[PDB]
Design a protein around this ligand. Structure first.
Ligand SMILES: [Zn+2]
Ligand SMILES: [Zn+2]
Ligand SMILES: [Zn+2]
Ligand SMILES: [Zn+2]
Lengths: 200, 200, 200, 200
DNA sequence: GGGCGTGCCCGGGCGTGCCC
DNA sequence: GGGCGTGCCCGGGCGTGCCC
């Protein structure tokens, strides 16, 4: 009955977890991940590689959904949307609706969804197993507004929720991470990690 | 025959109690809870998360009702309503009647009720059990006037009464807490707790 | 073309000016006037005597209009109205519309007007010459909200504009004074006069 | 043939100049004017009083037009518009089109225009002579975006151009001033004046 | 990569109807 | 008449995209 999707980690019976590349903290690196904060820092529209790791092979027809929600209780019930400026920037790839924050690049089977009851946006691709000898699959996500965008996220932190779902709709696994989209991911990761150590 | 709902705690056979988040006492925090006073301090229209804890699973069709009453004997028999200024502010979410003080956000099955005999307002949502691994459910309430509003609460303290009711109308459990809606919940919580220690 | 009436003093060819009684500055005096501030301090709904002085007798059919405007440039274009709480208090004398801030008591020929283009309220009585041996006429005004009323004046200072008008509509004279309606006119007059001396 | 209106001062045969109120430089004053910079600093949507001074009375039917242009050569040819976020904020007064940056408040004869060839916006009111004894007329303007608004002014300075025009369209006079719309006009005026003194 | 923006967060303290 | 309320004003200082 809640209109807020759950963020609770559920690694589930398939041993589902996420992985992130090691990029560093150079000032304006395009994408970097803080394990201490479970938080991805990235630039607007840049590639954000997310690895999907499983211990057991999901069944055929499994899907991978990504959605954003506001992290703070005060904002959770508000749908995460692109700001009006970027919604009109005509920067679509021909498939993503202009209002969707999260896109997937490099996938011929991407689907963009708007929930008819909650109005929330999500992007789905088929789950594909790793190639022989590889331990994970990688999806390239893109975030199409800065966290600071006026009339959109407006400086509020978001979580991305990644769910592994079978074709019937059963939740097989769920993981999430915080996101800041910003001009200087390396600067901002280092600032937030230092504030955690000094004041957290 | 009384037109005043009971505030008596009834944890009942399901072991029903409330829980509140730890927010601190920063001057203008949006919502904070004092265990010593059993009192929530929050800002107008801001999210107030309330956790529902049970020891035994309620039956299907159970409902959660919230209602406000004035705390002091002198004012108990007066219906708690929004003040005339805020009633006309056209700030409805499309479901809550403009006169109702307490709203629920983020729930697709909210129902707003006016008692035909007492004229008192209440807001009801279905009870949903916690997700596996979680110990409680959380409802987001909003209070749509300040305690100080002239022509409404007019500086008088209120209690929020939360009842767990089966579909037939049986009371399964009841809990309550005092509320102050104010501009500076952290200041005011600290003032009230200090006055309790010094003069209570 | 402006929707804001002029406040410019125009003593005019009849030598029109206002006079006020000497009341003192006892804490909760019902009405008191500060010449230094050209400001009347009064309590809600209490009698405020205003004297009309002329050097030459106005023609028959002359009228006396009172209107309120906000003093600050930022608020001048907003119509001064009673707040929603007091508008519903059913405290009318049978003639004053419930939304009008300024009333006249003790006059059998009072007229309450709403301007069809600016929506502003005014109250009008016939001008009557002083009795033989007297130098002025007195009108008893009442202000039906406090300056602090939420959803009304909301702590903003107002001016009352008194105009002497002939029956044809010509402006014969205009005077104005600031008003604060408050619980403690004597306290507040003394505070404002001291602030003028110390910080003005 | 140019699509950029001229900003050249033309006090003209009527001796047309502008005047501004003395407000000070308190940090968040709603509006303040720097003579040294010929620059108004104001908050979003707040009243900005502008005085019109003439030496000779303009003919009947004279109009007062206000328009914004970007100050820097690099941006002059771009039409000044509200940003997409504020354009959708449904904050219209019922007359101003939602895309127009400059509004006039308190005038029953305001007209909002879009030039059919340059697409530029302007707002026009009738010229009214000062009341007897007064030396100027005052118009209340409002600026409906911050200078910093993303997708609108985007941190770029603008000029407001005020023209006095006869009913036939002849330019009788022209004046202009720079504008910054910001959260803290007093801070920002002081910063800009200090930078002028130290680095200009 | 260093450092300036600039809307907004933050705690100190003044209001002002009402309690005493 | 003395003095406590309590929403809001106020200046200090942190953001964060962008200039350099
Ligand atoms: Zn954006
Ligand atoms: Zn209220
Ligand atoms: Zn009132
Ligand atoms: Zn804008």
């Amino acid at each position: 009955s809640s209109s807020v999707p759950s963020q609770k980690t559920y690694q589930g019976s398939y041993g589902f977890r996420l992985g992130f590349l090691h990029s560093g903290t150079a000032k304006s690196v395009t994408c970097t991940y803080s394990p201490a904060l479970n938080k991805m820092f990235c630039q607007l529209a840049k590639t954000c590689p997310v690895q999907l790791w499983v211990d057991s092979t999901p069944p055929p027809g499994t899907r991978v959904r990504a959605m954003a929600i506001y992290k703070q209780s005060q904002h959770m019930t508000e749908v995460v949307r692109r700001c009006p400026h970027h919604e009109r920037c005509s920067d679509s790839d021909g498939l993503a609706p202009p209002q969707h924050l999260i896109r997937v690049e490099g996938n011929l089977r991407v689907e963009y969804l708007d929930d008819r009851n909650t109005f929330r946006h999500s992007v789905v691709v088929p789950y594909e197993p790793p190639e022989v000898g590889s331990d994970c699959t990688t999806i390239h996500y893109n975030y199409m507004c800065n966290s600071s965008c006026m009339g959109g996220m407006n400086r509020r932190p978001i979580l991305t929720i990644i769910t592994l779902e079978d074709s019937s709709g059963n939740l097989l696994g769920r993981n999430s991470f915080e996101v800041r989209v910003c001009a200087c991911p390396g600067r901002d990761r280092r600032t937030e990690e230092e504030n955690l150590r000094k004041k957290g």
